[PDB]
Point group: C3
């Protein structure tokens, strides 16, 4: 292995082979770090998490195959997270308690995944993505940058279950899916769109449109929305909300003029 | 610290500083008790729970700040519960497995929180409150006495997400929210009201009224409800159900005549 | 006790009395095996699971009563599962992470229960049953063979909560309940029926019928359904899908001609 003299490893931690722990990594009590795991500098790994979780092939003969897991810098991984092999997570990742992340998945930077959330295999999550408590992300889902998935949201993939050909849901830039909503297979949720709480999304959602209900129905453009406390127009949200965003220290316009 | 000679502490338990464990406390295998935690007499702490969980300030320099957690007497805390600092829990608390409770929260007495439930920060829960499996309780929610939140219920707080001004849901005395229901931000659910299973509650619910659907719509007064097996009028429920209630040994009327 | 010389027991495992571990059982790091547990040959028990979990009677005087838990052969139990006493699980069981299973429950063979799923007490689950992520199975539910319960599905049991007489939901052979659906108490979901995603099922569902919505309404026979990618008729699904089924190596007809 390769563990930095500056890394902090608490009691109970169990470590396998081909593991690399960078400078200033703090690995809390009882974590289990299986083989082929690489933790980047300054990350914090929560108590009892288990990284490099066994893929199915393992169970064939109980011999662990190489399926490397990498986790970027300054991660803030909370307790008991379970993270599979063949997956990559970028920098400044942050999680809640008891989150599960499967294999063959890609998570960008400045992403957050709340308590109990379950990310399946072969999922793609971009940067500055916010996934709250107990969200279900099924295999083949595509979540672009700045997307927000609120508590208990569920993204499915089998259109006539159980079947052999799955279709991933794709959520475009800045879209917001409110709490307890479920999106049916292969659906496309367009940029800056808003899915109202509890909805059952059965058809694509066009850009900047608000849908609500079961089945979800279009009700208006997001620009119609006024802040309930201040009465100001809320969306596009990038212009009215910037906590934890790359433009926090400035304004979206100036920031995107630079980025582009 | 301060640990009672009569407390039982199993193997694997890890204890920090400024921890007080009262008489007849049984702390099961592998619990992690971080700093500033006070457990009151006769409580039972489930295997691997982690009490005094780190607040965000901790992560700044990995130096633990004082954020005292107190847990009342005769608690029956099941396995792997995670409980944050700056929170207070009363007597006779009971939980299911893998429950999470955040900071700056207050839980009364004779409260129950089922398996997977997630209580956010700055939440208020009164006495004799029943929260079942996997309920989501967002910051700023107010749950008064004798409220029942059934499995997978979700209480939200951001009315036009993502935004800066949140509005907590307030649930009044004896109200019942059936399974898989979601309540929108700032909504007021009145006393003895009944929210039918799976509903999407978008407007306040008046006292003793039954709402159902997405969006939830009023259908009748709870007094219209007849027990499906016995045909008797069910609500107000205090008069027809008393298991685990303070009037179990008597009748509601006699009991409330005394209490008041 | 009785532990086979061929069993593999990792570090941290804690074992009680009256425990029997058969040949080729692999018990991963830190599992807690309480009293009266019997694990059948070749099973794999995930890290930190806790088997023989305490029943309520335990808490009376913190003296563990005999409530035997049995787990059939070649189980693939993933991490942190919690399994109660007085329950029986058949062969080839498979689970996801952090699943909870209560007492007085019966699970058949070739059953799968995904991540976060919560099976309550006194539940009956047959063979070749598929329960996905975070499904809630309340006491008194009856799930027959070949049933599929997709993510976040919830089966309830108290028809006018809170009340004293519960009514279990019964799901017949091959039925499919899509994601985020909730079924009300005592409902009967008939064979080969299909409950569409997110539905609120309030009335029995007849055989081979598709219901959708809140409240769920019948829309057509499942035979009307065409595969979204291939355009072929999907149901009955036994004829179009056989991954992990007893007819995988043949065809349903030939297979059932033999079985019967
Ligand atoms: C989309 C949203 C912001 C509502 O916009 P809105 O302007 O408040 O809609 P209004 O209440 O002013 O009026 C909307 C009408 O559609 C209905 N409606 C509003 N939201 C609905 C929903 N989620 N589902 C179904 N119907 C809804 C209202 O009841 C009203 O119906 P009506 O014709 O009977 O009067 C809201 O539904 C929502 O989902 N907010 C997000 C809550 C959340 O999950 N936050 C994240 C968790 S913290
Ligand atoms: C409120 C409740 C008790 C129903 O009252 P009810 O008297 O049985 O209503 P009924 O079925 O007799 O008749 C109600 C009508 O409204 C509909 N309806 C009933 N419950 C509904 C619901 N939750 N959502 C939407 N529609 C509903 C019925 O289908 C029927 O509609 P119809 O006009 O097509 O006939 C029930 O909906 C409920 O939520 N029970 C709680 C289940 C639960 O979660 N227990 C806790 C978990 S164990
Ligand atoms: C039942 C199901 C397969 C849909 O059948 P369908 O043939 O695609 O229905 P269609 O979309 O072709 O047309 C159906 C009509 O009913 C509506 N509808 C379809 N599914 C609906 C649902 N779950 N709830 C409410 N309405 C629905 C459609 O929007 C359309 O309504 P319309 O009159 O406004 O056009 C689908 O609803 C479903 O639940 N699939 C399972 C998704 C899933 O959970 N997989 C498991 C998780 S991976
Ligand atoms: C900071 C923190 C977070 N978490 C987990 C809890 C939750 O599942 C997830 C998000 O917690 P959060 O960071 O407190 O929530 P966030 O600030 O992103 O969202 C909040 O603000 C947005 C704008 C509102 O719409 C939302 N409804 C609010 O919760 O992370 C924890 O468990 N502990 C923590 O200390
Ligand atoms: C007693 C007990 C409880 N729990 C957890 C499981 C669940 O998430 C929560 C409530 O379990 P419960 O006490 O068995 O359920 P309760 O008796 O409160 O509710 C029951 O009765 C009411 C009246 C019905 O409406 C309800 N649908 C029934 O479940 O506590 C456990 O995990 N293990 C236990 O041994
Ligand atoms: C194989 C495997 C499974 N699981 C858990 C994750 C999930 O909660 C449960 C099912 O995982 P799965 O076996 O990958 O899902 P399954 O193949 O049964 O279902 C899939 O195919 C069916 C036909 C689709 O309708 C469905 N939407 C797909 O997920 O088991 C894990 O956690 N890790 C694993 O390696």
């Amino acid at each position: 292995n390769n563990i930095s003299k500056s890394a902090i490893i608490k009691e109970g931690v169990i470590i396998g082979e081909n593991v690399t722990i960078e400078d200033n990594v703090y690995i809390d009590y009882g974590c289990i770090i299986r083989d082929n795991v690489h933790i980047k500098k300054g990350s914090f790994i929560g108590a009892r998490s288990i990284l490099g979780e066994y893929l199915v092939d393992f169970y064939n003969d109980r011999i662990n195959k190489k399926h490397p897991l990498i986790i970027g810098e300054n991660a803030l991984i909370r307790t008991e997270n379970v993270i599979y092999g063949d997956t990559i997570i970028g920098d400044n990742f942050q999680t809640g308690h008891k989150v599960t992340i499967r294999e063959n998945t890609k998570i960008g930077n400045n992403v957050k995944i709340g308590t109990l959330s379950d990310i399946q295999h072969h999922v793609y999550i971009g940067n500055y993505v916010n996934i709250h408590s107990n969200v279900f992300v099924g295999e083949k889902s595509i979540i672009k940058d700045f997307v927000w998935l609120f508590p208990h949201v569920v993204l499915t993939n089998d259109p006539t279950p159980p079947s052999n050909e799955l279709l991933g849901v794709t959520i475009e830039l800045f879209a917001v899916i409110a709490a307890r909503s479920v999106v049916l297979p292969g659906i496309h949720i367009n940029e800056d769109a808003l899915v109202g709480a509890g909805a059952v999304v059965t058809k694509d959602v066009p850009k900047e449109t608000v849908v609500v209900g079961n089945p979800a129905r279009e009700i208006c453009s997001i620009r119609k929305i006024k802040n309930k406390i201040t009465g100001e127009q809320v969306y596009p949200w990038r212009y009215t909300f910037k906590r934890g965003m790359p433009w926090e220290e400035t304004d979206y316009d100036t920031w995107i003029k630079n980025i582009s």
